[PDB]
């Protein structure tokens, strides 16, 4: 009863019994273990499978005299020539491996203990590749890049994190045992402002300034991503706002920035935004991921950052002006040309497969688990796909005999104007209102559609079974549809089975549809108009970027004549970085402008 | 002045969104066809339903009458709900805001 | 007895018993299993909460029809988790089961009546 | 709406026979207190706002 006695002594924080056990333990060292001198002593302290030793137990349990416990433990360890692997013990578990003393020491908020351990010696480069430290999902553990340096940054600890920086022993270059660098871990851990006091943004600046170099943002994980788009992929605005709008002014580290003031002659200052991984020229870009992720609910303010809207609005005139009108004009000519052919039945042929080929590969290769917003964009693609499918089968049934040749054409006839609505939301005037037209169909009208069809079909077939009179088939459904519009004739009742219920059922049907079913229509208008009407243009901008990205993908390599080339050589050091002009005027603050790299204002 | 703006902002917005549906659906039934065959009879037939007149079905030719009534069912429910939505809703925004800027214009 | 007579505040304290000091920690219902940073897992005792026992709080609360304060009575700590999670385990394979059988019952009787 | 939410699950449980212990929380978690066994239930609640150290626990290792 010695190993357990030592564990129990530090479990309750023995002020003096721990020293007595150390005296008893060091007296036992006189006995010859016959195998090894330090290994048996380590084995007497280590708990085998758990591997807690005398360090984890003293740190896991918090005592007011904890600083004295480690001080006595260090004195005994130092006097016994054990200060290496003894303090560098690792968890010998399947779900826990590589965890060291400094991990828990900073984990439970002991700054004084952390400084004491690093002074005598600690494994600041330890990696926790255990299952708990590297969960496959959210409710299994805490993910922080399995590095003690990042753990201080993640747990809102700004004092010890800089203490390790001056130690000149960290492994910031070494990303982790998983693939995510310290910045990769820091950006993933961050969240919205509603649950944090923007502490990640402050410590992102502190860590980057200590780096002083670009190798932090030029590393890729197993998935192969950079910290720039890791914030955009996971839908994080505040951490992305600081990265793009990096306005470093002081020297010796100005290269680690993305916003450079080219020239400020009075209240006219032009700022350059770096586009290393923003524009679509590169393989994987922020703009490509942001537009086509379908996993972010904060895109209302995510797309309106500084080097995004200028790259968005300007590209609309360069690209979309000659593409949105191109598709609209071709589709418009497609509509009347098919209209004339359909109406005169006693350009469209070649264009028939254009939609099917384009939509066939678009829907199949997209598969984003989208449609959480119901409206989305694949809803129009489905309508586009069916219209193309109905057209080609119409050609198929032209020589296939049988019947319903016009039925397929008529179904595709009306579906053409359905897609015309999606071509009317791109206008700068109707765009503020066309999006809410779509949502009423898919939220209110569809809700009223199925609740009415379930009553119309149910009651219609009831009278059909009851039956110069409306016998069955479509006469039953037509009879009720004329009452709900203001037409039709009642009763007659050529067969007398029980006419009392026939009029009673009709009485109930009319009163229910005109009161209960009409209740759910107008009532939704009060809630939607008073609340959603102020969020119409914001949703409109979501589909704004969908078209330009699609247009760019189909556009071949022939480029470099419409988008911002922005060479601007000698911006920093002796290399070249793409930039972008803004020409923002403040006209209110003045107070001198000295932050610039080019003396002459230039163009 | 506000009488003129409703014509050029709300009525015209409702005019083209209704004509695009009226003409599109009207010619669809004309191709499907003592009955409303084609030409102006197709557009008149739908315009009587949106006002409260006209006669339905009859359907002297049986190609696929199920869609004929279904298309008419969709047309009436869309115009009287979706198209009527964009008319009254604009009145709430314009009256509560623009009515105080009539004499100024 | 708090749940049968519709009493929320006295029931809120009983279920969310977060005793921390020793020598009496057993007289509690909320135990923090582990708190590694801002991720803390709390254990709620279920001696007389789940339906395994003869008479349970959940069985009484749902089927008493004498409480007007059930809006906040059912959303206590060890109730909604036992409610929402059981929806996927039990109701997902039961609500759709009854709905599909009843739906097939509807058209099948519809076809017989019309034919 | 939540009132009728629990009506169905209680009815479904009553008709379900004794065959159980595969969908609901078994939560044994032995040695929770003294030397007995009590059923428990996991929550995994994250505060992320207060911190100020956490020392109230019975299991040193975070476990699963």
From Swiss-Prot, chain D:
Residues 1-64 are cytoplasmic. Abundantly expressed in CNS. Widely expressed at low levels. Detected in dorsal root ganglion (at protein level). Expressed in the keratinocyte layers of the outer root sheath and, to lesser extent, to the matrix of the hair follicles (at protein level). It is found in: Cell membrane; Cytoplasm; Lysosome. Non-selective calcium permeant cation channel. It is activated by innocuous (warm) temperatures and shows an increased response at noxious temperatures greater than 39 degrees Celsius. Activation exhibits an outward rectification. The channel pore can dilate to provide permeability to larger cations. May associate with TRPV1 and may modulate its activity. Is a negative regulator of hair growth and cycling: TRPV3-coupled signaling suppresses keratinocyte proliferation in hair follicles and induces apoptosis and premature hair follicle regression (catagen). Belongs to the transient receptor (TC 1.A.4) family. TrpV subfamily. TRPV3 sub-subfamily. Homotetramer. May convert from a homotetramer to a homopentamer to allow pore dilation. Interacts with TRPV1; may form a heteromeric channel with TRPV1. Interacts with SNX11; this interaction promotes TRPV3 trafficking from the cell membrane to lysosome for degradation. It is linked to Olmsted syndrome 1: An autosomal dominant, rare congenital disorder characterized by bilateral mutilating palmoplantar keratoderma and periorificial keratotic plaques with severe itching at all lesions. Diffuse alopecia, constriction of digits, and onychodystrophy have also been reported. Infections and squamous cell carcinomas can arise on the keratotic areas. The digital constriction may progress to autoamputation of fingers and toes. This is Transient receptor potential cation channel subfamily V member 3. It comes from Homo sapiens. The lineage of its organism: Eukaryota, Metazoa, Chordata, Craniata, Vertebrata.
